[PDB]
Symmetry: C2
Subunit: 41 residues, 2 copies
Amino acid sequence: MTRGTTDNLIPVYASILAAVVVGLVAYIAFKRWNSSKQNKQ
Amino acid sequence: MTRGTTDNLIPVYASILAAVVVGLVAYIAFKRWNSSKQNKQ
């Protein structure tokens, strides 16, 4: 493979991962509380 | 790279894009209402 030395893909996958991790947690989370179901977090 | 002829990456990018967009919108959105700032939607 042929890619940049560093700081090229690091921020790429890192950022993308965050958007996915937050989107999944946030969505589901806010999607659960919507049922007014309280529980120890 | 080695992938199928078609209909292989179509659903890949589509989904990934969703999680990302949702993560940004949901996060920010829920991050704004958290301030209890009401406004005409």
